[PDB]
Amino acid sequence: GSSGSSGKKPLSVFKGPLLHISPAEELYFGSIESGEKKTLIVLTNVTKNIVAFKVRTTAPEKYRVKPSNSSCDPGASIDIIVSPHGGLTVSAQDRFLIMAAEMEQSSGTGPAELSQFWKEVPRNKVMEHRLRCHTVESSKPNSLMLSGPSSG
């Protein structure tokens, strides 16, 4: 008969006024590869100024988020890896957070300058973006399988 495997899905990002968040609000810990199941977040600084971003979560001592404290120059994209402990698994109640605040003119991107900027920048200016985890379960188009994109 007819059968296949895998499907497809669109990719959207939270168009932030300062720092962009990728993906928007959908984390999928599991790549097509049978290697590691870590998600990589992308932050596109649309602004023309430095933006200090920070990654948080309800369980930072479970998920390895790095960088979790840094900045992203204007007109550049950063990469934030998110790998869970090498024992447990991706939960559902688990939630991630990403901060982004526009810095002054010339501001470094260290543990100091930041600690300072995060001290000067008001929480009102601090843009927080909470991400969600799309726990993978029962991979199939609701019973049986059916999917065949444009191949060749």
DSSP string, 65-95: EESSEEEE-TT-EEEEEEEE-SSS---SS--
Is 88 part of a structural domain of the chain? yes
Is 142 part of a structural domain of the chain? no
Domain containing 55 equals 13-134
Tokens of 80: 């934030």
Q: Tell me, what CATH number does 19's domain have?
A: 2.60.40.10
Contact 66/41 with Cβ under 8 angstroms?
no
d(CA 94, CA 132): 8
Tell me how far CA of residue 57 lies from CA of 84, 99, 120, 131, in angstroms.
12, 11, 23, 9
Tokens of 6: 């895998």
Is 45 part of a structural domain of the chain? yes
Residues before each break in the chain (C–N > 2.5 Å)? none
- Read off the amino acid at residue 16: G
Q: Which of 89, 87, 124, 125 is nearest to 104 (CA)?
A: 125
Is 147 part of a structural domain of the chain? no
- Dihedral of the alpha carbons of 74, 79, 80, 83, in degrees to the nearest 10: 180
d(CA 54, CA 80): 10
Is 79 part of a structural domain of the chain? yes
Is 48 part of a structural domain of the chain? yes
Number of domains in the chain: 1
Is 3 part of a structural domain of the chain? no
